[PDB]
Amino acid sequence: LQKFPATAPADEIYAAFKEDGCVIIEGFVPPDQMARFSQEIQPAMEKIQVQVTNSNDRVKRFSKLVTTSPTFRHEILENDLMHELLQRVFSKPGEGMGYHFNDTMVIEVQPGAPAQRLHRDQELYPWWNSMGPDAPECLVNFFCAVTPFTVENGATRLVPGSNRWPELTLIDCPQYDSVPAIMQPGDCYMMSGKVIHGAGHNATLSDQRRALAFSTIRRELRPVQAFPLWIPMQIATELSPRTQAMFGFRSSVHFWGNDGKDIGEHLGLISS
Amino acid sequence: SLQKFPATAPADEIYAAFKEDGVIIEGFVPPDQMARFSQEIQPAMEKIQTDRVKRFSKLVTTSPTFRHEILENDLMHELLQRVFSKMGYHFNDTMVIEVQPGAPAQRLHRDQELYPWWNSMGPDAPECLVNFFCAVTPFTVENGATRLVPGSNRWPELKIDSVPAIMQPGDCYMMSGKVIHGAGHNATLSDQRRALAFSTIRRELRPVQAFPLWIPMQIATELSPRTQAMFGFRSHFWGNDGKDIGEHLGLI
Ligand SMILES: O=C(O)CCC(=O)C(=O)O
Ligand SMILES: [Mn+2]
Ligand SMILES: [Mn+2]
């Protein structure tokens, strides 16, 4: 797993991403912004009841971020490097923006919580493993640290070469060896949907491991969150245009449109 | 390699024909519904203007007959369950395409070029898109009936022999995204070939129409629950933290 500062050119960061399916970006989010956001979402996180048994076994998952945290909708969402890398991954010259959000979720592995099974994120699109290691990307998660990731508080366990394996399968597996995603608040891993990984078991006793996941998918795929339905137009009018398209308030013809027109015309976001 | 079945035909006998040839269903939509629907969308279609083809998608808001009768077709869902489910399908688009006198032939294509990676998955790939292309007015060799190619789905690598899609009002052609086809030249002087397209796609795929964002909720409440999920007003995809989006919108 290579590592870059977020001051590094996008061509550089994305090259390691293509090769290994997986890069680490240091200060991908400014640590002051991450702690404002984290502070802002805290009354809501406290209001979440942990379950013990499931992917929600002693894990907090919370997606109401753009509606709850001003720092998220105004500053954290407006990451230029993210869009450079997303552009390079998903977009074709002349087709607009080739990507949108699948989900934007804070995941907090509680203490004692168990190692999540080794999966690929692209198992969500069941057919995608068949196109093989040389398939186009469907999914890229920018899995960010809100609080520190240690090996023992549940840092994501990643397999670096998974990106290029012979047969991408449901991990029916013939090899049935993982590395922790150690990082500091503000860092992030940028992970292909081809990369095998899973949450780590939080062996600590009070270290609530908090993360901020930006799950992005190609324009032609349906997201797990019905964002433009449950986000209010009040918040949407505070987002930048590229961010409104991230959440399905714009079409920025091809998909998610109104008779070939952008849906944002209908919603008032675009005026002729 | 192209078969025709009634609408009383057993859905598997219909799905078995779809599967190997990539199926015609006579009387898919009852002719009297299709007739009334076409009457309701007619003012709005009057209100529309080198390509000499009219396309109209605001069917759920325009037409009570479509909204309440034509959308509720139990055979359309029996077949989509057999094609997509492991509700594992939703709508891609609902369009009235009306080809006008003199309009040229449209280029042959597979509908699944919309998801540009699907052809690479070959002729044994899972289905991404099913179109139920139902005839509103009659289709004839003259007025530009669709040209289709029946075995072109099963081809190893995804000027050409074809069949015209001859049908009466109410008949559908149920067509895989893998099937090559194209509207014909409308050579008539007066025959506006009107058609009704149900483009359906599997649940993991995005639609070209942002239905739940332009169909008003005054309409959305007068859809059956399966038809609300068809249009994106219910839901695991398209949710609200795993919870059904239907709740937050008040329909559940
Ligand atoms: O939190 C982690 O370490 C991984 C989480 C993950 O992979 C998921 O939420 O699907
Ligand atoms: Mn995952
Ligand atoms: Mn077509």
Residue numbers in the entry:
A (entry chain A): 9 to 61, 65 to 182, 186 to 190, 194 to 269, 278 to 297
B (entry chain D): 7, 9 to 29, 31 to 57, 61, 68 to 103, 108 to 179, 192 to 268, 279 to 295
Quote the authors verbatim.
AusE (Mr 35,100 protein, 314 amino acids) and PrhA (Mr 35,121 protein, 314 amino acids) are very similar (~78% amino acid sequence identity) αKG oxygenases that both accept preaustinoid A1 (5) as a substrate to form divergent products through dynamic skeletal rearrangement. Non-heme iron and α-ketoglutarate (αKG; also called 2-oxoglutarate)-dependent dioxygenases are widely distributed in nature, and play a major role in diversifying the molecular scaffold. This superfamily of enzymes employs αKG as a co-substrate and Fe(II) as a cofactor to couple substrate oxidation to concomitant decarboxylation of αKG to form succinate and CO2. AusE first desaturates at C1–C2 to form preaustinoid A2 (6), followed by rearrangement leading to the formation of the spiro-lactone in preaustinoid A3 (7). In contrast, PrhA first desaturates at C5–C6 to form berkeleyone B, followed by rearrangement of the A/B-ring to form the cycloheptadiene moiety in berkeleydione.
First, crystallization of AusE required EDTA treatment to remove any contaminating metals that co-purified with the recombinant protein and subsequent anaerobic reconstitution with Mn(II). We succeeded in solving the X-ray crystal structures of AusE complexed with Mn(II) and αKG (AusE-Mn/αKG) at 2.1–2.8 Å resolution. In vitro analysis showed that EDTA-treated AusE is inactive, and its activity was restored upon addition of Fe(II) but not Mn(II), indicating that AusE does not utilize Mn(II) as a cofactor. Despite numerous attempts, AusE could not be crystallized in the apo-form or in complex with Fe(II). The asymmetric unit of AusE-Mn, AusE-Mn/αKG, and all forms of the PrhA crystals contain two, four, and two molecules. As expected, the monomer structures of AusE and PrhA are highly similar with RMSD of 0.6 Å over 248 Cα atoms. Careful examination of AusE and PrhA structures showed that almost all of the active site residues in Region R are conserved, except for residues 150, 232, and 241.
